Structures are given as structure tokens and as C-alpha cells.
Paper text:
[name] is an undulator-based high-intensity, energy-tuneable (6.0–20 keV) and variable-focus (20–200 µm in diameter) macromolecular crystallography (MX) beamline at the [name]. It was the last of the [name] Structural Biology Group’s beamlines to be constructed and commissioned as part of the [name]’s Phase I Upgrade Program and has been in user operation since June 2015. Since its first commissioning experiments, [name] has proved to be a versatile MX beamline that expands the experimental capabilities of the JSBG beamline portfolio at the [name]. [name] beamline [name] has been in full user operation, including remote access, since June 2015 and, at the time of writing, data collected at the beamline has resulted in 83 PDB depositions and 62 publications.
To further illustrate the capabilities of the beamline, several single-wavelength anomalous diffraction (SAD) experimental phasing measurements were carried out on three test proteins. Diffraction data from a single flash-frozen crystal were collected at 100 K using an X-ray beam size of 30 µm2 with a flux of 2.3 × 1011 photons s−1 at the peak of the Zn K absorption edge (λ = 1.282 Å). Next, a seleno­methione-derivative of the feruloyl esterase module of xylanase 10B from [name] ([name]) was crystallized and cryoprotected as previously described. Diffraction data from a single flash-frozen crystal were collected at 100 K using an X-ray beam size of 30 µm2 with a flux of 3.3 × 1011 photons s−1 at the peak of the Se K absorption edge (λ = 0.9792 Å). All three structures were then refined using the PDB_redo server and model building carried out in Coot. A summary of all crystallographic information is shown in Table 3.
Residue numbers in the entry: 803 to 1085
The structure:
């Protein structure tokens, strides 16, 4: 029974959500070959996953020095939080994918190209998303059911995905990372605006839920960028995505550590994928 709030506040998951849930989603290790050579990712399927149904899909990127196994390892345990939240009805069932920017010519900045060409067709040909095909026209037609997020260097990845993939992705979750593209915060905001202009999309067709900690170094460059974005007509600031499309959650006292950042995903992910959803829900 999720309901939108207009200014949602930081709230960690209870400590019991960090322990294994008996209603556990299956995690599948996959290997594929793309423009950056042979690489792996993990796919989280919700408990009761039925491939005759269609699922929203969220792709989630690791930070510097990490890999495609980090988010579901003992150092993070995001699957436990997902399992609990789905079981208790706080979060609608979805597929969550944890890829990597490691390998070949791949960098956090350039990952969007591999994302487009290899990762979406590989994953969404095998698993049941709202994509009816994985041609560019099929991917673009299911964009309201696709999201991208990430932490630190994976937050940087998210910003480059947004500016190059608005045709394919409607929901964005940059966590503790800023957009390195321009010599001022206004250059950053203007580049995002120009990408939106080129896409032809209305303000009801893209959504940005950013977050960091008040004690995370990422705040220093994120906050000026967010302020420059708020001044654009392209963004209506509120966490009530029935009305607007842009929010920045700052967790008091939180440091640059997955121990906190996993809770940002707990807070924000329930806000995604309801606008023009195919179920009859009152939020």
C-alpha cells in the first residue's frame, strides 16, 4: 500500500531487513559477449517470478573498485532488503540487474554504449520485461518500465545513461555521484536540458530521484548541480511523481558507504514505475 509523499525523508530499512528472507528472489549469474568482450552480470528475479507476466526492470551500477557481484555480496546484501520489501508489499515485484563497467575498453563514462547494444538485448531477450522485442523500436516502446541507477562512479554512469539513453529509460537514480561534463554546474544542467529537448519527451515522461549523505564527499559537487537543475523548466521539484519529476534526498549523518546507500534504494525504489502503469493502483 504505497502512497506518494511530496518531500520524502531518509529512513533506513529496519535491521531485520538485512537478514535472509524465506521468500527469496532467485539470483542468476549470466555471461555475455559484447562490444567490450566477455563480461558477466547478476539478475535478481522476484519471489514468485512468472515468465508469462511482464516485470519492470531496474539496472543498478557498482562503484569504483567494485564489480558485478558487489551489490548482492555480504558487504551490501541488497537482495535481503528487496526480498523483505516485496514480501511486505512496500515494493512492487521487479527484476533488478547488477552489471559492471569493468573489462575491455569499458569505463564508468562510456558504459551506456554497451548498455544499449548488448546488455538490454541480452537480458530482456531471456527474462520477461515489458519489451515485446529487443530492436531499438521495441526497447524505446517499453521505456516507461525501465530504470537506471548507481553509486559513486556508478552514479556518474547513471548521468551519462540519462543524457544518451532517454529514448530507452524513464527513471533515474544517481547516488553519490555528479555529472562530469562541463566546466560549471550550469554547463551540466544545460547539457541535461539539451538532451531532453532532443528527445522530444514531455515533463511527465522522465523522472530523476537523486540521493546522497550529508557526510558523503559527493555532496560537494552534487548539490550545485541539483540547484542548477531545479532552475530549468524541464524539472518540477517534488518526490510526488504524480505531480512532478525531480527530487534530491540528503540522509543526515550518512557517509560514503554502501551500509547507508542501500537504504537510499529502499527509500527511492518504491517511487518508480507507477506513472502510466498497466495495473489499476491508487498511490
Amino acid at each position: 500500500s504505497f502512497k506518494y509523499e511530496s518531500a520524502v525523508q531518509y529512513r533506513p530499512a529496519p535491521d531485520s531487513y538485512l537478514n535472509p528472507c524465506p521468500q527469496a528472489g532467485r539470483i542468476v549469474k549470466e555471461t555475455y559477449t559484447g562490444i567490450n568482450g566477455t563480461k558477466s552480470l547478476n539478475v535478481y528475479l522476484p519471489y514468485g517470478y512468472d515468465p508469462n507476466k511482464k516485470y519492470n526492470i531496474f539496472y543498478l551500477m557498482h562503484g569504483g573498485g567494485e564489480n558485478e557481484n558487489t551489490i548482492f555480496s555480504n558487504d551490501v546484501k541488497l537482495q535481503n532488503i528487496l526480498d523483505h520489501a516485496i514480501m511486505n508489499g512496500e515494493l512492487e515485484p521487479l527484476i533488478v540487474v547488477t552489471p559492471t563497467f569493468n573489462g575491455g575498453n569499458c569505463t564508468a563514462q562510456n558504459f551506456y554504449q554497451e548498455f544499449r547494444q548488448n546488455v538490454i538485448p541480452f537480458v530482456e531477450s531471456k527474462y520477461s520485461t515489458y519489451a515485446e522485442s529487443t530492436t531499438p523500436q521495441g526497447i524505446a516502446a517499453s521505456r516507461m518500465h525501465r530504470g537506471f541507477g548507481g553509486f559513486s562512479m556508478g552514479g556518474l554512469t547513471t548521468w551519462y545513461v540519462m543524457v544518451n539513453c532517454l529514448d530507452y529509460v524513464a527513471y533515474f537514480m544517481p547516488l553519490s555521484g555528479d555529472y562530469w561534463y562541463g566546466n560549471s554546474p550550469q554547463d551540466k544542467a544545460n547539457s541535461i536540458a539539451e538532451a531532453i529537448n532532443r528527445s522530444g519527451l514531455s515533463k511527465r515522461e522522465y523522472f530523476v530521484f537523486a540521493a546522497t549523505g550529508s557526510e558523503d564527499i559527493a555532496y560537494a559537487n552534487m548539490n550545485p548541480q541539483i540547484e542548477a537543475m531545479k532552475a530549468l523548466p524541464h524539472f518540477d521539484y517534488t518526490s510526488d511523481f504524480s505531480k512532478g519529476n525531480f527530487y534530491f534526498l540528503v540522509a543526515p549523518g550518512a557517509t560514503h558507504w554502501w551500509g547507508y546507500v542501500r537504504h537510499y534504494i529502499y527509500d527511492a525504489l518504491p517511487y518508480f514505475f507507477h506513472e502510466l502503469e498497466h495495473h489499476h493502483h491508487h498511490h
